[PDB]
């Protein structure tokens with residue numbers, strides 16, 4: 001459950017948040033395969049509540065109605081077509097598995113659902129599964145409201161309703177079996193693994209019992225006996241009783257401290273600075289690297305009041321964001337996930353975005369296609385961070401340097417830092433309010449290297465900055481604090 005099942009030499013996944021299946025299939029073929037991406041985290045592919053007040057928010061997809069593969073992203077045939085096409089070009093699919101809960105207990109009964117299935121939250125009836133009142137934790141939860149009230153009580157966090165979402169009785173073999181039926185349908189289609197949503201809200205042992213029912217990966221594409229990659233969404237910033245280490249026997253965990261702390265450092269909050277990153281990793285209180293799924297932002301916390309609150313860097317903070325993503329992709333800790341977002345009309349009132357619910361770009365509720373512009377950016381309000389040169393080239397950097405040790409660290413005691421990855425890559429950052437002009441030991445073979453942040457190696461030439469490494473491994477780097485991107489990265493495959 002710990003290995004991503006990507007092709008050798010592909011080291012990241014991208015969250016194509018709210019993308020349609022047909023667009024992901026095309027993206028696999030036209031971009032993700034040639035540019036070395038390992039796989040795609042998809043939005044929940046199972047039927048959810050259609051919420052019209054407010055209008056089709058992103059978060060309706062975290063309110064299941066059934067396990068039919070029928071959503072605003074597409075139907076089952078479209079989902080299978082995507083998985084097949086992506087696997088056929090060596091790009092994996094990871095499903096966001098929403099298995100802790102069904103929909104909100106106060107959602108009105110009827111057929112306001114993405115496949116038109118009937119459901120009745122008040123009577124606990126989800127006949128398209130089927131689930132009934134016997135399948136929820138009403139009787140087990142001990143809080144006066146029936147909802148989670150206090151995160152200092154680890155039992156209610158697991159047995160009570162997260163935000164009122166009907167909480168499945170995951171101790172029951174019937175319920176475990178219905179979830180495994182859904183997950184095995186997906187595995188047999190060809191999915192490579194799962195994000196387990198809301199894992200903090202499930203007992204480690206109930207997750208384990210579900211995972212024990214799962215198949216090995218589809219043997220038309222994967223070696224015999226391959227286990228699905230599992231990454232559990234556990235929001236653990238410290239200071240609560242539940243620790244993500246309780247989940248290590250099941251799979252990896254999301255390390256939300258990673259982006260929270262990286263954001264504070266890059267924003268220079270509370271006296272933090274990039275020189276402190278020399279011991280980034282477990283020295284910062286993080287989980288073991290081999291259990292970490294890392295990211296700068298995710299779909300929830302990029303809206304500003306998730307895990308990390310306002311420290312989280314996002315595409316809205318493009319300059320600092322590229323820096324943070326670059327540091328993450330260069331540094332060996334963790335398995336990396338890159339975010340890919342849509343734009344929405346963010347509107348802060350009293351410090352909070354009142355439009356943080358807005359769903360993906362749409363016409364009358366129908367999600368818009370991703371259009372590709374001649375310059376390789378996206379239209380229709382898709383941000384496509386994973387296509388930004390500075391991010392895509394760092395996805396490739398991570399592939400090139402895979403397995404190489406962290407070495408040749410430099411810092412100026414403030415916010416000018418650099419490090420290498422064995423003899424295969426080197427990266428230099430300037431987040432101070434003055435210039436960084438210095439000769440540094442790079443660990444690389446002598447030669448001329450293209451900076452992959454300011455440009456590309458194309459047709460035996462560099463389109464941006466060139467770095468000259470001498471026989472001693474040293475090279476001069478010059479980065480103004482006014483540079484478009486105040487960091488430079490070079491690697492073995494950017495050498496002329």
Ligand SMILES: O=C(NCCCOc1c(-c2ccc(O)c(O)c2)oc2cc(O)cc(O)c2c1=O)[C@@H]1CCCN1C(=O)/C=C/c1ccc(O)c(O)c1
Nearest residue numbers: 059062063098162163165197198200201233235300306307
């Ligand atoms: O203000 C909201 N919710 C309360 C604060 C966020 O708490 C939630 C957490 C959450 C927050 C902090 C924690 O420490 C924690 O253990 C859990 O996880 C969820 C997971 C879901 O599948 C569905 C949800 O509705 C939630 C949720 O509401 C709005 C309105 C409804 C959805 N929502 C949201 O804000 C939706 C957020 C959301 C949705 C999916 C996620 O995976 C997620 O992490 C957050």
Ligand SMILES: *[C@@H]1O[C@H](CO)[C@@H](O)[C@H](O)[C@H]1NC(C)=O
Nearest residue numbers: 457458459460461462463496
């Ligand atoms: C590199 O750029 C130079 C100058 O534009 C050009 O003469 C040369 O043909 C290009 N390609 C190589 C492989 O040198």
Ligand SMILES: [Ca+2]
Nearest residue numbers: 158159167201
């Ligand atoms: Ca639960």
Ligand SMILES: [Cl-]
Nearest residue numbers: 195233254298
């Ligand atoms: Cl996540």
